[PDB]
Amino acid sequence: MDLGASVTFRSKALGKGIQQGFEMKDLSMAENERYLSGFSMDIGYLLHFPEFFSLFKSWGDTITILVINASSLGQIYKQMFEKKKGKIETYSYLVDINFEFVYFKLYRRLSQETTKLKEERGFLLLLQSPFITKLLGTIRLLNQMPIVKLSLNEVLLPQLNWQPTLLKKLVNHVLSSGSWISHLIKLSQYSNIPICNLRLDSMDYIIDVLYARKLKKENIVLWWNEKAPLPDHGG
Amino acid sequence: GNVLPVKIQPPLLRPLAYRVLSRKYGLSIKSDGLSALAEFVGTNIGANWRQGPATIKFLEQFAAVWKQQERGLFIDQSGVKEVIQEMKERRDYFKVINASQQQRFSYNPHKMQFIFVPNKKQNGLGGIAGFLPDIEDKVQMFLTRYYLTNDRVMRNENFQMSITPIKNLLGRDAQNFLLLGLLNKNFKGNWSLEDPSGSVEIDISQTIPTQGHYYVPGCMVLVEGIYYSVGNKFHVTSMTLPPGERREITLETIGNLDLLGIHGISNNNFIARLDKDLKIRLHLLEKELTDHKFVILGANLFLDDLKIMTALSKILQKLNDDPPTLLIWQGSFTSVPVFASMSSRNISSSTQFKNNFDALATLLSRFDNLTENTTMIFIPGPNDLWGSMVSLGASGTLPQDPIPSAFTKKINKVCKNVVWSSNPTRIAYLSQEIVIFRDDLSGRFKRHRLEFPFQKVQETRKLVKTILDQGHLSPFLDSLRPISWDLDHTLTLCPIPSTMVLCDTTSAQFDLTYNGCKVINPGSFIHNRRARYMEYVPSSKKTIQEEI
């Protein structure tokens, strides 16, 4: 709230403060945030559909799904390619193409893939699964990079012909990721909030942040509360 | 039958049964009883119709088995049951009970005797709504509490000076008096005392209270002071809570009633009593009591954070090799209150709560010794399914319902002995009575303390002394703690159980004992990067153990 995403320094001890943790309460100020940054950086993509763990690389060109399909994948990719050519062209500058298909004991490969990405790129993770914290705790390497979460849960299988509908789901998520990240960039650079702390449905968070900071600029106690749907009144 | 059964003719066995069962003892033998005796004779074909002593002595044993059941004036198809009882007569004996099934017992002041109350579940229909209490129950509840407190006061050795009713204070003044009643605030906003006769006001400006008590509204207080008819002010000079009584002297006034009766029960027809088996059970308890150990944990164990699961796994690793008798888990099992979900995008609160118990069934798969040998007790906390769904994590009704069965469909199958009870629950041992009660007490008695115009070990001393002198689990009015109109008898400390499990997350652990009762104060399960759980030896000895 107080510092925001646009933080800066006015120390005028940089080395001593960067080797250790730099203190905040003595030097603090928030600059303007009309434009956050000119984004040009790779992305991550890890998903799960209740054993449908999936991964994709923006700069990669291979697809492998954890345990007729390849032709359907190619035709569906091309079909929605012509369907959303306009959106693809508009959001190409955010994320940019055909790729190979594969459908692979096998459940240890998440750690290996995360390690390959970690020692191949620094890149932001987009994760979509109904077990957010479970997947965060099962993989120890996911804690070392910033992650932007896109949790849309309550996905189920129709017990028959799940392959076409899951292909539709994955392809629309991939080809709408550009619109998603554009919307998040707009909301972050308008609300002065870091991109990893935001969500599409977390609209109440912006209300809370703005109202709390305007009350803090006033002389009114925030009665802020956490992990409890009640106002704080001192007990 | 025997190895060589012979099919009898009932007419020629009829005289043998009839004489013994209609002239010496017994009466009204039915045809089914005759058939049961017929098959028993088939099991005694050896030299029968010519063997005198054995058949008649086994009939005498039948009498000694069936006299004690009801009154024994009829024998239905159960005759085979008493035959099997004969064969079988040729740790158990302990029970756990919740507030829902506790036996109901009213009180009558003019006859100075408790009266059994018929259960609505057993005689009524109860098909649609049988649990809803009636209107006058809340009217009579405070009356019953006052009656019990007045009886306790009158039975005191010191009191044989006499108290005075409130209504008798109108015509006299400038004279000292002694009186007791409910302490509360009037509609105006002053301090007043209430009695069935009437009510008066209180003057506090020169009151010296007896230290060691939490003087809180809703608690019976003995008031000594001088009436003044100039206004209506009772100038109090001292105030003290009524004293308590020990278990033996409490029971001896009612002999030994089967209130928490496991060997026998009373009903509307008659009253029951027993003291011959009490010493037998006491001496039975005196042996192999160290083997029958039972262990409890701390409060508010959350099943969502990884640290609690890790510490619990360590505890189960240490506890698997030596399975105790009873293992009690107390406190809320979810760190967030559950309520209606306004978002259809994320995981529903009910589904999350259901999943929070499924993983427990998996963790219990690697501890087959503990699962096989030790029973399971689960007690709801402040913000479980039923309470937090309306109270939103705040305080609510005390007779809390058990955990719903739809959310515990895997614990009952993985384990063989799982019990869910109310927030106050009762266990009946061979010679011990223990209650377990989980809520917050230190903060409640700290914030609402009365102000009198004028090292942490003493706070728990005051708390225990107050809760035992008042003799009620919830010494508060209906404004603070709403209580169901009928079940309040379950919250009463009239039988004054031998040991009480005072679970308070806001109070330090302690092992005090007073007034013949021993109290244990389990703390929070995790604190200051440590895990703690305590075990009680039935020989009045306690042990505290911790695993980092």
- Total count of helical runs of at least 4 residues of chain B: 15
Major β-sheet of chain B, in short? 7 strands, mixed
What percentage of residues of chain B falls in helices of 4 or more residues? 25-40%
First-residue to last-residue Cα separation of chain B = 63 Å
Shape of chain B: globular
Specify Rg of chain A, calculated over alpha carbons.
21 Å
Biggest β-sheet of chain A, characterized?
Answer: 4 strands, mixed
Number of domains of chain B: 2
Please tally the β strands of chain B and state the result.
21
Shape of chain A: globular
Question: Quaternary arrangement of the chains shown?
Answer: part of a larger assembly
Strand content of chain B: 15-25%
> Which class best fits the helix and strand makeup of chain B?
alpha/beta
Largest interface: A-B, 12 and 15 residues
What's the helix and strand layout?
This is part of a larger assembly, with chains A (235 residues) and B (548 residues).
Chain A: H1 14-19, E1 43-47, E2 54-55, H2 69-83, H3 85-91, H4 109-118, E3 124-128, H5 132-138, E4 147-149, H6 162-191, H7 203-217
Parallel strand pairs in A: 1-3, 3-4
Antiparallel strand pairs in A: 1-2
Helix pairs in contact in A: 2-6
Chain B: H1 10-24, H2 31-42, H3 53-66, H4 79-89, E1 95-98, E2 105-108, E3 113-116, H5 120-123, H6 136-154, E4 176-185, E5 191-194, E6 199-203, E7 208-209, E8 221-226, E9 233-240, H7 247-252, H8 276-285, E10 294-296, H9 306-320, E11 326-330, H10 349-363, H11 368-373, E12 375-379, H12 385-391, H13 411-414, E13 418-420, E14 424-428, E15 433-438, H14 442-447, H15 457-470, E16 499-503, E17 513-514, E18 517-520, E19 526-527, E20 530-537, E21 541-546
Parallel strand pairs in B: 6-9, 7-9, 10-11, 11-12, 12-13, 15-16, 16-18
Antiparallel strand pairs in B: 1-14, 2-3, 4-5, 4-8, 5-6, 8-9, 10-20, 14-15, 17-18, 19-20, 20-21
Helix pairs in contact in B: 1-2, 3-4
PDB class: replication
Keywords: Saccharomyces cerevisiae, helicase, cmge, initiation of DNA replication, DNA, DNA unwinding, replication
Entry title: S. cerevisiae ssDNA-sCMGE after DNA replication initiation
